[PDB]
Design a protein around this nucleic acid. Structure first.
Ligand SMILES: [Mg+2]
Ligand SMILES: [Mg+2]
Ligand SMILES: [Mg+2]
Ligand SMILES: [Mg+2]
Ligand SMILES: [Mg+2]
Ligand SMILES: [Mg+2]
Ligand SMILES: [Mg+2]
Ligand SMILES: [Mg+2]
Ligand SMILES: [Mg+2]
Ligand SMILES: [Mg+2]
Ligand SMILES: [Mg+2]
Ligand SMILES: [Mg+2]
Ligand SMILES: [Mg+2]
Ligand SMILES: [Mg+2]
Ligand SMILES: [Mg+2]
Ligand SMILES: [Mg+2]
Ligand SMILES: [Mg+2]
Ligand SMILES: [Mg+2]
Ligand SMILES: [Mg+2]
Ligand SMILES: [Mg+2]
Ligand SMILES: [Mg+2]
Ligand SMILES: [Mg+2]
Ligand SMILES: [Mg+2]
Ligand SMILES: [Mg+2]
Ligand SMILES: [Mg+2]
Ligand SMILES: [Mg+2]
Ligand SMILES: [Mg+2]
Ligand SMILES: [Mg+2]
Ligand SMILES: [Mg+2]
Ligand SMILES: [Mg+2]
Ligand SMILES: [Mg+2]
Ligand SMILES: [Mg+2]
Ligand SMILES: [Mg+2]
Ligand SMILES: [Mg+2]
Ligand SMILES: [Mg+2]
Ligand SMILES: [Mg+2]
Ligand SMILES: [Mg+2]
Ligand SMILES: [Mg+2]
Ligand SMILES: [Mg+2]
Ligand SMILES: [Mg+2]
Ligand SMILES: [Mg+2]
Ligand SMILES: [Mg+2]
Ligand SMILES: [Mg+2]
Ligand SMILES: [Mg+2]
Ligand SMILES: [Mg+2]
Ligand SMILES: [Mg+2]
Ligand SMILES: [Mg+2]
Ligand SMILES: [Mg+2]
Ligand SMILES: [Mg+2]
Ligand SMILES: [Mg+2]
Ligand SMILES: [Mg+2]
Ligand SMILES: [Mg+2]
Ligand SMILES: [Mg+2]
Ligand SMILES: [Mg+2]
Ligand SMILES: [Mg+2]
Ligand SMILES: [Mg+2]
Ligand SMILES: [Mg+2]
Ligand SMILES: [Mg+2]
Ligand SMILES: [Mg+2]
Ligand SMILES: [Mg+2]
Ligand SMILES: [Mg+2]
Ligand SMILES: [Mg+2]
Ligand SMILES: [Mg+2]
Ligand SMILES: [Mg+2]
Ligand SMILES: [Mg+2]
Ligand SMILES: [Mg+2]
Ligand SMILES: [Mg+2]
Ligand SMILES: [Mg+2]
Ligand SMILES: [Mg+2]
Ligand SMILES: [Mg+2]
Ligand SMILES: [Mg+2]
Ligand SMILES: [Mg+2]
Ligand SMILES: [Mg+2]
Ligand SMILES: [Mg+2]
Ligand SMILES: [Mg+2]
Ligand SMILES: [Mg+2]
Ligand SMILES: [Mg+2]
Ligand SMILES: [Mg+2]
Ligand SMILES: [Mg+2]
Lengths: 118, 59, 150
RNA sequence: AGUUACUAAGGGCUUAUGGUGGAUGCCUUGGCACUAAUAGGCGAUGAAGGACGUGUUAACCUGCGAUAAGCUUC
RNA sequence: GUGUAGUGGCGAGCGAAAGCGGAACAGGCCAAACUUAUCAUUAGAUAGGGGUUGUAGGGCUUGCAAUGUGGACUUGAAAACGAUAGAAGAAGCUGUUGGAAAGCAGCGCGCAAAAGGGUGAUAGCCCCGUAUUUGAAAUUGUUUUCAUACCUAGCGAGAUCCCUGAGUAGCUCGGAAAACGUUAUUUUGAGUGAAUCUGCCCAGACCAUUGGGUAAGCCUAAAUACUAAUUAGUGACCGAUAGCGAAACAGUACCGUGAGGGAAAGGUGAAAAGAACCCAGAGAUGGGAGUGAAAUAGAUUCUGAAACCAUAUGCCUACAACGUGUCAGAGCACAUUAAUGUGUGAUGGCGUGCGUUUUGAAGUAUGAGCCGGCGAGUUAUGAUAGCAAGCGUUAGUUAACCAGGAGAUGGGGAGCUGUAGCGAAAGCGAGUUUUAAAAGAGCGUUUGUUUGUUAUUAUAGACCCGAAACGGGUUGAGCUAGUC
RNA sequence: AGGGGUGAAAUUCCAAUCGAAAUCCGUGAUAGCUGGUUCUCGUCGAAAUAGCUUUAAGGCUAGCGUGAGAUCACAAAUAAG
RNA sequence: UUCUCGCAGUCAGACAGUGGGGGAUAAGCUUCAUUGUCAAGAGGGGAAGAGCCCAGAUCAUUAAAUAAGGUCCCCAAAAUA
RNA sequence: UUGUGGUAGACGAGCGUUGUAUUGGAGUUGAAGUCAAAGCGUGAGCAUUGGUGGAUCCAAUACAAGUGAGAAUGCCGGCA
RNA sequence: AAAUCCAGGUACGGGUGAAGACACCCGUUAGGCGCAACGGGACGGAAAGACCCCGUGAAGCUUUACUGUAGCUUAAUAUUG
RNA sequence: AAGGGUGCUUGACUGUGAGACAUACAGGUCGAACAGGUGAGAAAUCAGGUCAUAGUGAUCCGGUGGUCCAGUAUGGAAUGG
């Protein structure tokens, strides 16, 4: 019983080739280089999911910090005032407010500024 | 498989599968051993657990 | 069960076959369980049984047993044991009676020996070449008898 | 003074097509391993194996042997 | 029987002979005595009769009973069963898609034939065949019957006489065969050398008793070993890198002085109907025409993958430090296995391959130019363990072999494991070994077997590839060295 | 004519090969040494130590892993005395 | 982590702290004892680093609080005295 | 509720190829092969449509393996 | 045509790192692509280091290494009086 | 005191041995207690070599002494146990 390989190797090889579509030259043509690039690209994608979670937080912090410095308050004290006033809002939504709704963002800063903590 | 001719003539089996054996240092040079040592080595013994597996497949 | 749906009892037919060459996903790829670059990982095999790497093996270290009856064979005996003979159903136990019951082969001339201590209730009449003193005591403590063939 | 598109000698990516190439699939006057029988030899009455030659027919192959792609008889 | 008794630098290892169960079965014939005839009968030689042994046989002398049964046997005659060519051999139309029906559907039919092959697709009824019934002038095989040669025959008595295989059996010195590493048995290179049924040999040195058998002469069917070839057939065998090296004109082309080494290469279409003719061209050829269902089936001839080379719609790219990707992200261009869609990616953040072997490899260590195919844990016989099934407490299970489809299986109980252990052993026995001991201590005072599957292991080449080598046979002095 | 030949002698020559030709066979020699060993997922997960070894790039046993079973407390861990 | 059975792999280790031997209070040296990491372990700090510090990655989330470390710009985050 | 880094290694559960045995089914109104696409799965993997192709193939339950290729300065063919 | 070739879009300085970097960290420089040159580097290419060590590897040679043996020599015995 | 002297002696015993130490194995070390028959001592008690730790070599093979075992048909013997 001589089992002969055909359509088994080609199908699993073409899967890797399909994933590595859009690469530079041989990196999409040859199966070997395509397989290596897909594995490396998967590693990159894994690492950058974690790094995206951190980098977007940093960008929100930067935007929020800038928006406060125009009013004379700093980021380090703005978050402290937020905690003492029990207000719980993401820096993402707060930055979205300062870019989309300047008046309502200014309302939040006014209350945290001076109103009695709790 | 053939039973080793040296494994036999030196290892006898028992009811529960223990492999009986004879103590060594009982061939010559008697004055270099004490009578306590000689009378303790006269009695027979069994292979230890470290060798039981190696002798089971040898027999 | 039909021929188009036939099934074995669970955990009786199929067991995990350890394939040693088909990929690392099975945990048995590349090296295939031999280890790494040593004697046990080559095609030769696992040396010799009983070997100890040059140190004198255990059998070569221990004295040889002695055979007093050199070149002889122990005389085999057919032994009737008292603890189990009660379970067997027969009276006047002689050589001929054992043949129909097929305890002894009709093409065998081995001498019959009586052995045992367990008390028996009904009496039996043995025809034995040899009998123990206390086995005879037990048999004759009941209403049985024993004759010693010569 | 300031912010600015078009360029593609050439190249990159996607898709479609053409060409070189004979992988995969289907098949086979071919191989392999055996079963049941037969048989277990040919040769000085010239053997096995070859050379040469033979056509109404280029060569090759096959058949045949100056009775030469065949002769006689049943 | 058993990997048992044994044999082994007692190491690696090697390993019977009895017995038991089966296949088949068959026993015959010479020498010597004694006698006949002939050889200058110095025969011690030739040709005949007689004899073939062991619970001894035969010869010598003397009687009874015998005319048969059986052969491994010669010629013939007759018959039967075959082999080498063959003869006969049943059963269907209509409609639909289609180039084409045998497919599909409707209504039928035959079968001791529903094995197979071909016929424009997939046919029990289209054809050839197959089942079944048959047939040989000639050659040849087996068996049977009849006759005919050759061989083949019992039980006594007395005599007390003769014959029974010689450089032979033994023995010594060196080897060997048997499982044995030489030793009772077998054999022999050298030397020596017996006896004659009250005899000789054997039963593991050797002697005696007992018992077994007749060496130094020959022939012997059957069961057993193998398949280059002939006929029929089969395959959980291969299907052009596979299967024989060889599907083709393969041991060919080709390599070498020679022995020797040794490839690749199959498929048009149902049918060549193989493209008349026109145009360009020198022509091959190409574009039309024509045949065809299909010509992108056109002889480059089934299908036609990737690497590789070119063309083009769309996006991006000439201040730009790049394992070439990833996460965000404008603009541009489209519209899908309708999906928070797809193609490209100005720009921002992060980012030193894959296997190998190493304490540690981005590696200035190693392996791969790319693509496709092939390429490395198997089989046979045993052991142990896990899991599961069958049968069970005088259990369990067969091996060879026979019948049966190259079957499941039935017969076959030879044997194997367990049922009682201890001891070196005789031996004893729920006990036994040690010992003066019963005390003490060691071992025991119970939990089976046959299969299936998996894992490991032993013998085999044993997961695959790789040495420099060693031994045996042949081919080479047309180059070169010497000599003639 | 190859555990041979030849050598005004160098290990020269013996068919572009000679510390002992070429070829076939034993043969699939052996290699404790390199290289390679092909699908997936889940649970757990080491060692580079001791002794012996004509042993040091290898092997055996112990130590460390894993699967199954038993031991519930008298076993083993973490703190205080 | 104790006992019994089946199957292993491992016998080339490296560095950091601590106590020493050899060296010269030299070695990224060599040989031990002990605590850890790497081997077989990514992430954050150390500018870049196998072994140092903080810790232990099941997958997705453009959610929040923290450890070592840090807050002029590169690069997230500070002010007073 | 306690967990889910992982090499050597141990254990368990599955995918895929070829063929055989039982059932059913598709196919010149177009099977295998083969190419493309904006699908489905935890993974081996599995579908749908269209082009090419011209005759076999599929599903389920079991069984047997020449059963899984990226590396061996691997062999062969082709092409850079 | 040729050896070569993991895929490449292939700068320099200091540092780092398996201890001598086109690719890592920090800076500097550099429009895209050829042609003719010359060899600095790519521890450049060709040869699984010939030196060294390891293997209970091979082969050649040597000797009062071991075990054997052709040949030579001596004696007994047979041919042998 | 385990050092010195004296008297009597030979326990520098036979068969064993619960339980432990240390160990991969093989081996090593300590030992209560029992039976037999002794030595010293009035007796209790002590004695299975020395104040303790080095003074030693497996298996195979063959030899020696004893022996309540075997003795290849039987009785011996050979040869073994
Ligand atoms: Mg393949
Ligand atoms: Mg693993
Ligand atoms: Mg293993
Ligand atoms: Mg190693
Ligand atoms: Mg390796
Ligand atoms: Mg190993
Ligand atoms: Mg040694
Ligand atoms: Mg252009
Ligand atoms: Mg382009
Ligand atoms: Mg006819
Ligand atoms: Mg007909
Ligand atoms: Mg038909
Ligand atoms: Mg004799
Ligand atoms: Mg021999
Ligand atoms: Mg006689
Ligand atoms: Mg005898
Ligand atoms: Mg005779
Ligand atoms: Mg071929
Ligand atoms: Mg081909
Ligand atoms: Mg030629
Ligand atoms: Mg045309
Ligand atoms: Mg072509
Ligand atoms: Mg074609
Ligand atoms: Mg620009
Ligand atoms: Mg600039
Ligand atoms: Mg830079
Ligand atoms: Mg960049
Ligand atoms: Mg980027
Ligand atoms: Mg980079
Ligand atoms: Mg791999
Ligand atoms: Mg290295
Ligand atoms: Mg190194
Ligand atoms: Mg580099
Ligand atoms: Mg190098
Ligand atoms: Mg290397
Ligand atoms: Mg390379
Ligand atoms: Mg390849
Ligand atoms: Mg089993
Ligand atoms: Mg049977
Ligand atoms: Mg007792
Ligand atoms: Mg059972
Ligand atoms: Mg000449
Ligand atoms: Mg030689
Ligand atoms: Mg020289
Ligand atoms: Mg030459
Ligand atoms: Mg090989
Ligand atoms: Mg070797
Ligand atoms: Mg874990
Ligand atoms: Mg460690
Ligand atoms: Mg350690
Ligand atoms: Mg080694
Ligand atoms: Mg171990
Ligand atoms: Mg260390
Ligand atoms: Mg060390
Ligand atoms: Mg240190
Ligand atoms: Mg120091
Ligand atoms: Mg130090
Ligand atoms: Mg160091
Ligand atoms: Mg390692
Ligand atoms: Mg880390
Ligand atoms: Mg860092
Ligand atoms: Mg975790
Ligand atoms: Mg915070
Ligand atoms: Mg802090
Ligand atoms: Mg900042
Ligand atoms: Mg895990
Ligand atoms: Mg199938
Ligand atoms: Mg299709
Ligand atoms: Mg394969
Ligand atoms: Mg080229
Ligand atoms: Mg440095
Ligand atoms: Mg090398
Ligand atoms: Mg050597
Ligand atoms: Mg050798
Ligand atoms: Mg002489
Ligand atoms: Mg005194
Ligand atoms: Mg004293
Ligand atoms: Mg010896
Ligand atoms: Mg005798």
């Amino acid at each position: 019983m001589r089992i002969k390989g055909g359509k088994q190797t080609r199908v699993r090889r073409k899967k890797w080739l399909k994933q590595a579509s859009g690469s530079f030259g041989t990196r999409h043509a040859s199966y070997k280089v395509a397989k290596q690039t897909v594995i490396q690209a998967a590693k990159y994608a894994y690492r950058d999911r974690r790094n995206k979670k951190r980098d977007f937080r940093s960008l929100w912090i930067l935007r929020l910090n800038a928006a406060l410095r125009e009013q004379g308050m700093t980021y380090s004290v703005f978050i402290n005032l937020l905690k003492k006033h029990n207000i719980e809002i993401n820096r993402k939504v707060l930055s979205e407010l300062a870019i989309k709704e300047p008046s309502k963002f200014n309302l939040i800063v006014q209350k945290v500024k001076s109103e009695q903590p709790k | 498989m053939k039973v080793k001719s040296a494994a036999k003539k030196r290892f006898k089996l028992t009811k529960s599968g223990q492999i009986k054996r004879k103590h060594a240092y009982t061939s010559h040079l008697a004055p270099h051993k004490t009578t306590k040592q000689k009378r303790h080595l006269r009695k027979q013994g069994t292979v230890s657990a470290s060798d039981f597996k190696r002798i089971g497949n040898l027999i | 069960m039909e021929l188009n749906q036939l099934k074995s009892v669970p955990k009786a037919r199929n067991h995990k076959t350890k394939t040693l060459g088909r990929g690392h996903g099975s945990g048995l790829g590349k090296t295939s369980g031999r280890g790494q670059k040593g004697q046990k990982a080559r095609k030769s095999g696992l040396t010799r049984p009983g070997f100890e790497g040059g140190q004198t093996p255990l059998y070569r270290r221990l004295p040889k047993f002695g055979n007093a009856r050199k070149g002889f064979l122990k005389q085999e005996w057919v032994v009737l044991n008292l603890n189990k003979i009660a379970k067997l159903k027969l009276d006047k136990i002689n050589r001929a009676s054992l043949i129909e019951k097929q305890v002894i082969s009709a093409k065998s001339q081995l001498p019959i020996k009586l052995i045992g201590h367990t008390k028996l209730e009904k009496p039996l009449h043995f025809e034995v070449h040899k009998v123990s003193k206390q086995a005879l005591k037990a048999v004759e403590n009941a209403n049985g008898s024993v004759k010693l063939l010569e």
